[PDB]
């Protein structure tokens, strides 16, 4: 399962997908 990070970089960790 591929997810998109691209607003979560140093504020949070954790990854998600809609």
């Known amino acids: 399962t591929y ?3 691209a ?5 949070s ?3 998600q997908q809609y």
């Open 7 to 11: 607003n979560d970089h140093d504020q």
């Open 3 to 5: 997810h998109v990070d």
């Open 13 to 15: 960790r954790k990854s």
